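Researcher: Following up on the earlier apo prediction. This time include the ligand. It's calcium ion, with the SMILES given after the sequence.
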Amino acid sequence: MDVAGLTDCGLIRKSNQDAFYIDEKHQRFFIVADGMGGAAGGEEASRLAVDHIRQYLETHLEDLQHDPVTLLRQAFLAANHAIVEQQRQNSARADMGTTAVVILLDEKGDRAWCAHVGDSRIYRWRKDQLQQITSDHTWIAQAVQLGSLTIEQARQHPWRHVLSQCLGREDLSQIDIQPIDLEPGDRLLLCSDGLTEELTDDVISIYLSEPNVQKAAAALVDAAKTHGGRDNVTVVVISV
Ligand SMILES: [Ca+2]
Ligand SMILES: [Ca+2]
Ligand SMILES: [Ca+2]
Ligand SMILES: [Ca+2]
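Model: Understood. Below is the ligand-bound prediction.
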């Protein structure tokens, strides 16, 4: 199983508030976070999220891998509290927040638990078929899903940019957690919306077809900038 990860400012943003982590030693879990907030930032929130989810998983994986939904929920809440605590304390960064998408693999490696809060995404790629696993926690996504406003078509409405869920909120209840089964040759992609605001699903699928995940990850980031690079962009590419 090969894995590559990459982050980039883009061509507009002066700093990168994205963060990611790959479990290089054991390849059990993978994390991408997209921060927001100034003063700064932002980068604080997404760093906290990645660090706390990582440390919670590291500590409790042995004990709780039989119950991944409980494990992932507690990891996310650990992250959420760490951010809220740094908020409640610090006035300037009181509104800092971040997305997170996490993949946790079962020990066997045939099953992946996908957990997320926000509009960062997880995709699975299998035999030239690209499938978005996570559903965006945005107002307009959840609108289209209902509907109406089921024109897609969705953005550009003003938001688009506005999240219905993010880490760093005392009012956090919804954490989406779902299992997906894996097959040899599948690719997994974790990405911030810096990727998917620039690249259509069709384009992403092309780049995920490259067996070399190092080249694939670099291609994705490079393509996102060619198309505009209006935001921070982060990708983690996993070959199953
Ligand atoms: Ca951001
Ligand atoms: Ca967005
Ligand atoms: Ca973003
Ligand atoms: Ca563009």
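Model: The pocket of calcium ion (ligand 4) is lined by residues 198, 227-228 (CB under 6 Å).
Researcher: Noted. I'll compare it with the apo version next.
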